[PDB]
Amino acid sequence: HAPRSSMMSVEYDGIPLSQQYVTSYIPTGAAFPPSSVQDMISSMKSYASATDLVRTYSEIPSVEEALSTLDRAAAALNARRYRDALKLYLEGGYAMANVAERQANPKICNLLTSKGFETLNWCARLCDWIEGRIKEKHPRPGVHKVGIPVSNWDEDWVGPFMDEEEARRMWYTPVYCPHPIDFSNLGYRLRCVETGRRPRLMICITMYNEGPQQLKATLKKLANNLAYLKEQMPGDEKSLTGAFAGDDVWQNVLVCIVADGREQVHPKTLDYLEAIGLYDEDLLTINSAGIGAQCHLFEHTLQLSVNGKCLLPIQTVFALKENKASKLDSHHWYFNAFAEQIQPEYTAVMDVGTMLTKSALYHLLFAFERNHQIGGACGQLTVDNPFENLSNWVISAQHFEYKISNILDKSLESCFGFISVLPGAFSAYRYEAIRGAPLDAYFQTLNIELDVLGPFIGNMYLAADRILSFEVVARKNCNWTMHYVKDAVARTDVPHDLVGLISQRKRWLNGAFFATLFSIWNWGRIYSESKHTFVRKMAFLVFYVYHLLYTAFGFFLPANLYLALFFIVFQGFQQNRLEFIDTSEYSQTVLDCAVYIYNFSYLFGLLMLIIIGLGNNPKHMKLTYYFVGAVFGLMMMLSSLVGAGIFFSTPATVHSIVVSILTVGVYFIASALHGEVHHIFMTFTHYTALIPSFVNIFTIYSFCNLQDLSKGDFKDVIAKRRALEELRREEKERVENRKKNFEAFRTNVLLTWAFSNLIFALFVVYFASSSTYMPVLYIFVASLNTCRLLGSIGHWVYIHTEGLRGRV
Amino acid sequence: HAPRSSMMSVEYDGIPLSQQYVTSYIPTGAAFPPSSVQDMISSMKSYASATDLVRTYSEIPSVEEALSTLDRAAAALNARRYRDALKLYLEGGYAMANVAERQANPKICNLLTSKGFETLNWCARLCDWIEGRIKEKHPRPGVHKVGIPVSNWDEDWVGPFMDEEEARRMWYTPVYCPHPIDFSNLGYRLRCVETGRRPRLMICITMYNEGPQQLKATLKKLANNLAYLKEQMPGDEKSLTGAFAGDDVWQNVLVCIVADGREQVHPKTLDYLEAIGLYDEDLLTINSAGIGAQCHLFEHTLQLSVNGKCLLPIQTVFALKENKASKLDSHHWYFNAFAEQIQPEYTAVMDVGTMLTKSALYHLLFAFERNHQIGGACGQLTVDNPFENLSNWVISAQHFEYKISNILDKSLESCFGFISVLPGAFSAYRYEAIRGAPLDAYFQTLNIELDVLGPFIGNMYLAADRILSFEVVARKNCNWTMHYVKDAVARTDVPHDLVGLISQRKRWLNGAFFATLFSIWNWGRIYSESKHTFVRKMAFLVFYVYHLLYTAFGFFLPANLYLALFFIVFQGFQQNRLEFIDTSEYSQTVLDCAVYIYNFSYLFGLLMLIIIGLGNNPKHMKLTYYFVGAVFGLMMMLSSLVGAGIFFSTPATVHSIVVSILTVGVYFIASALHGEVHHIFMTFTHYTALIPSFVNIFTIYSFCNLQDLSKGDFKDVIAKRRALEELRREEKERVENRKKNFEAFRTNVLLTWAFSNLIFALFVVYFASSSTYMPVLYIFVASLNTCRLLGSIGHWVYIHTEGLRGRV
Ligand SMILES: CC(=O)N[C@H]1[C@@H](OP(=O)(O)OP(=O)(O)OC[C@H]2O[C@@H](n3ccc(=O)[nH]c3=O)[C@H](O)[C@@H]2O)O[C@H](CO)[C@@H](O)[C@@H]1O
Ligand SMILES: CC(=O)N[C@H]1[C@@H](OP(=O)(O)OP(=O)(O)OC[C@H]2O[C@@H](n3ccc(=O)[nH]c3=O)[C@H](O)[C@@H]2O)O[C@H](CO)[C@@H](O)[C@@H]1O
Ligand SMILES: [Mn+2]
Ligand SMILES: [Mn+2]
């Protein structure tokens, strides 16, 4: 018992030595007499020293404290606590006014002084509002924009004419507008509106987490397009006339760069923007202290110089949003605020890094002006430098896919005047067919939270460009059609690895599938509500039948691929149907061995792909995806060689040659007709080596991630705490419910798809022979490719004929 | 062009009327003359009105503002900004001193006055520390505990003897100790230490999100156990002697209730705690304003009354933690702080809701005192009210599982003196074998973040009780063994649904599997480091061989179950091996039909289970899990009936009857030997109907979730913003890396397990017959069950013999 007593004695000796430890008993109900308390308070003199120290310390303010007080004032005004907001605003204004004297930098001194004066005036206005002498709804500090000289200006530059105010001053203003519809009601204006200019074309360049090189290339290409438009010959049949003429075209084009979040912008991108006079950190930090702005917009008529050539000036508005949001939110801000204020004629949308050729804008504007029935158009999407880096299989496969998709599908859809725009493409509309209901349908997701809509609507709007296209075509009391321009070439930079391709295709496939389902369900609105010609309605009905058949065939693609490969190759080897060899006798331990190996490999690969895709992100699993892709590619190459041998050994019956043409040679026929044939010759092998990887891997990973979507008393204090707890718990419960619904939806869809494919494959393998199934598949494929070839030929005839027959 | 001009004119007319909109140009480099600025400032008189309004408003302080200022002061002191902390503390102290006068409630007035005086004294001490007259390391406000009378006290109560201070006053103190090891260094003490009492037994009741009923039942059962210990007859061979005698036992027991988070405690639980005098919201809110405490502890010697019986007083310490953490954190606080201070002899751990019988503590203490080689013990775990609600299959299955596991496995492991404790059980240790290294191994997860350790260590410590048990057994330079007490019955409340059972078993299975792997790898430490008897080392080696074989068999359990069912039932039906019927001829379209149906159903069920488990949480998917479980249960019941028919039709050879006994009848033999036989008769059918559901569903869901684990200038402001951005980005990157590693680990483990099972099943089906595989399985199962039966019989002999042979 010695150690216990020793440790207790040690604790007791450590007890001695607001001291370290005080034990007190508070008696309730006595409430104390107000005689000893006063003397006890007056009996302590260290309070005088503490007060002296605090008073001495609090004499000199600082910039950081002033900014923090202004931030707290902004929060308090957001919570509608006007007394505290007024007090904190007064404190911050006085602090900044005092601080501005000490700063050595003249720019900082001027900015601080101006901000202090603005804050004091706002305090006066808020005091007047509190008094009730001035009555207003939801007061806010007055809008104030600051123009400052650009830090770096090029002495040697050539231009048509530039006022010094426009040339050297960059303007800035932070905005609070929570609903971008009310942008022009709150008093915000742009430099173009102030100066009297009325641009007719607007371009939006969405940006998020990008290097300087992509933005620089995009701006250089846009400047080249403007230069080409300027040098357009006058008084010519092909030339454009009107606002887009020469020597004044640069005044009719405005470029909006809408960043997605100040916390995610690449620092080098910010440095490059500051170089061209479109960003300044000190101005943003000082002038946005008290406003609590949603986004800050800079304005400048930038001049760019490349080597010895001076590009034309570009009117640019850079809107940087404080918090991260979706790209649809950037389009919300752009469309609503800037289109409603400026009221343009055409509205073009592109991403960052899209490098246009010198004639893209000319062709788009020419189509829009000549046709006058076009409510929307989309240009051709291409891969930058396809011939270079030809050793990479992914790049060549993507190049072949882009070319074939553009030619066949875009031409066929554009013949009927209804286009499903590829995501990431460079598109354009006119701000007369998207004025009302189409934009409401576009932004319904932002207007209403996902909980009310559900998972189907969120997945549908994951790619909402097709929604806008359909709303344009099927608009009530209007007949707007779409068009595809072959000469508006825009070159992007596709991913060089399988994993980035997997993620990109995941987003693409989810959006496309659910947009297609929405279009199929709502196709009736074209007849019920729109007012087209009868011929147009009949053509739409024909295209609807074709669309139904094509989608139904596409849904059962993995099963058909497996059945075709299995039947042809492996039951030609096992049952001696390969025409260039006789496998009749053999060991008989090899005839079944090939089929067993093929079935086991296919099933194990599919199981592994499903397990990986439903689980970990496709970034750690690079090796496994590469291995599965390599196995499938080798299998497909072997199948292609065997099929070629079988075809060449056949005596080439008329039916065989006709089916071969209408099945495979449609690609080469269309490519030769449109003149883009060498790309097909170069990339056909690379695409063939990746067909099964495309189908299986991309569809499985896309379907496995359908849920991935974006002066009170004490009792007053107690009630406030309880209310906060209740709100927190209800918010957590709502989030859990949303997650539950999305997960259930994605699981149901994946199970339906996978089990439908498995049941189809089993019931065809067990109950059907190769002689009773392959002719049906050949007929189906030949029909689809014949329709696509007819559409492509029709588009070529239209593009080479309508110019002559424009009179009729 | 009329609408455009009209809208521009509308905007211009809306322009007119800190006003609504001001456009200014700030010239940089001028810096202004200090002549006009002073006159301009003095030219505005509304500032006088604003100052008067602010001065008038700021006269009267409030409770909420004082508490907010104290919170800000606590944050500033946490950031080591002593000037601002001192200023805010002074402001809060003065505000509370002024506020205390106005309050009508005497208790609130007294608490506010005392807190204000304490805050002022702390301000004086901090000012002295800033001056440097007093030099100290990391200053903090002095520890101050408040004792207040209990709101509700029972006038009619019977007890041995209670001082009025102990009977009527409840004590409270908030603690700041960040590392619980330094609890006694900072000056914190408990009431037992102050009063001079030295308890010898401590009990910890971990609580999180529980209703009042469970806590009330646990406290009533503990009081009953204390009453039984008190009434123990003196001067008897069986009776305990020493500190645990009668009439003073209640002074030697302390109960620690460690809540997990103030934001998650059920409000009714807080109300019940306040009823028995263990919680008060006003005291917590007032006295914890400035300290910024990590957890707040209340102390009381509670008296409980049930109906007409008055239970014995219980010394209770309720420690409520501010933020949520793991249960291991609660054990960290309990063990380190309270054990290191009190220095007890025994330390018992239980959950909340565990209802003990009247003799559990007596049996545990008797074993600990008599054996003296026991470093740890665990009691029997049972299901409350098993016979009632017998219609529910899940409850009966769990009852059978608990009984069989306890008897067979616990007896076999306890014979060798090494036990793997069931999670959630009621266990005990002595605070002499866990003093040093075992607790360090226990808390290594809390000491080091998971990023350094990895996923294996986190999954291992998900159930870290087995780690503590192994460290106790294999402690260096000591020979501590464990023991299992059959008579320490603790009854829990098992879940009534399949989904809660699924989640609970997920946690159990992950912890058990990885703890078993750790034990297998580190078994060598018993021979290399520990100092046991040679006989003990040989017994440990034998048990190690048995453990290896048992774990290896358990890993391949689903494949063996599938093979046994398929072979016996379905290749007895197809190949005419069912002895009670002749299926030789038949349609021949049915002989293969049964096998095809069985294979397809099994494969589809497994695929659906994997897809669901890897995806959505098992709460929305109740119907699918129920359907799969029902299908598997019907299949298992049919297989059981067919097997019984086959066995009874056989002429009962000697080998057959011996294998049948040593395979199945071991359960009934052991149950009859230990006297718990009727439960087996009642629940055998219910457990048989859920064997396959257990195996497949629980193992798959457990393996699919291995990743689920818990005065500067402007340039100074710019640098601070940049530093904050860098820290935020690095934190996000680190979190992403951790998620990547955990997901990769879980995917690799799941793939290994599933593919090993599939390959084993395929290579046994294709290359082995029923006559060359079933005898091996029978031999393996018979060997395992024979070893388990021998262990159970040995434990029974020891428990009924060692009492006589205690002399030798
Ligand atoms: C979905 C996906 O994996 N896309 C990848 C794809 O870009 P990918 O071309 O597929 O698509 P993006 O998502 O990058 O394009 C959407 C457009 O909106 C912008 N945007 C993007 C995200 C956002 O939250 N808000 C926003 O406004 C983008 O900058 C772009 O202008 O290849 C890039 C490399 O070549 C990768 O870096 C991208 O991760
Ligand atoms: C993991 C799981 O799904 N367990 C469920 C199981 O309890 P189950 O008995 O399986 O296990 P618990 O996780 O509830 O038990 C852990 C012990 O520590 C406490 N604890 C719990 C969580 C925590 O974050 N910190 C903490 O300290 C618990 O109160 C308990 O005393 O059946 C209960 C209903 O009968 C459910 O409500 C639980 O959700
Ligand atoms: Mn891009
Ligand atoms: Mn529980």
Author numbering:
A (entry chain A), B (entry chain B): 23 to 39, 49 to 741, 762 to 859
What does the original paper state about this entry?
They represent the apo, GlcNAc-bound, nascent chitin oligomer-bound, UDP-bound (post-synthesis) and chitin synthase inhibitor nikkomycin Z-bound states of the enzyme, providing detailed views into the multiple steps of chitin biosynthesis and its competitive inhibition. The structures reveal the chitin synthesis reaction chamber that has the substrate-binding site, the catalytic centre and the entrance to the polymer-translocating channel that allows the product polymer to be discharged.
To obtain the donor substrate UDP-GlcNAc-bound structure, we mutated the catalytically important residue Glu495 to alanine, which allows the enzyme to trap the substrate in its substrate-binding site. The uridine moiety of UDP-GlcNAc is fixed within the tub of the reaction chamber, which consists of a loop region from Thr237 to Glu241 in the GT domain of the enzyme, through a series of interactions with the residues in this region. The GlcNAc moiety appears to be solvent-exposed and oriented away from the catalytic site. Superposition of UDP-GlcNAc-bound PsChs1 with apo-PsChs1 showed no significant local or global structural differences (root mean square deviation of 0.54 Å for 693 Cα atoms). Structural comparison between the apo and UDP-GlcNAc-bound states revealed that residues Pro38, Leu39 and Pro40 are in different locations, indicating that the N-terminal extension of the SP subdomain in the UDP-GlcNAc-bound state adopts a different conformation. The Mn2+ ion in the UDP-GlcNAc-bound structure only forms charge interaction with the phosphate groups, with a bond distance of more than 3.5 Å, which is much weaker than a coordinate bond. The donor substrate-bound structure shows an additional N-terminal region from residues 23–39. It forms charge interactions with the diphosphate group of either UDP-GlcNAc or UDP in all the substrate-bound, product-bound and UDP-bound structures.
